[PDB]
Symmetry: C2
Subunit: 111 residues, 2 copies
Amino acid sequence: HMAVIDDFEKLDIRTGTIVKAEEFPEARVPAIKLVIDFGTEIGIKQSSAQITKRYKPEGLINKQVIAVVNFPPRRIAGFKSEVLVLGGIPGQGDVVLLQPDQPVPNGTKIG
Amino acid sequence: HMAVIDDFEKLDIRTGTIVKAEEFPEARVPAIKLVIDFGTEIGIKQSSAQITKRYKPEGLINKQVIAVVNFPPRRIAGFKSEVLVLGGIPGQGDVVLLQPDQPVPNGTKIG
């Protein structure tokens, strides 16, 4: 139950901008396919995000989001999800996205 | 270097509301003491945050923040800092706080 700072330092947590978002009707659990620009050191990354409760694709473009970018990928229905986009989880199937409280460059590190 | 999801699962990342904010510097760097309500289970925690570049105490009260709650405490700026408040780091001495993009209850878990 207790972590150390070393646990946290293993993670590469970064800001990126949603540049594409589409409904993902092939996922078992409702999801949106995201493409996110993490700047040129990290690259442009795909994510499958179970965020259909509060969000629509037309509302996601140009949002700054927060993701762990140094995990192995997960394939769902053939789509390669490359990053874990972080959010608060107020209840089952519910997500509230995290964001920097003001704009920062893509690839800005979190600590 | 790469991480695995359970490096992430070791962390307990929670939302909380800043209920008090005071200037509490170190000798060599300014800093703010945050008193944060993480809801009824976690309770009230304190944090030393080097966030004075963009923020004043008056602009911090009532803000929902994101923090790692299950680290060992550390002594800093004359008190026990119990929680790591997360922000983007755009440059030397600069911090942009993370927030939920919409209000969530205190103690909402991040995933």
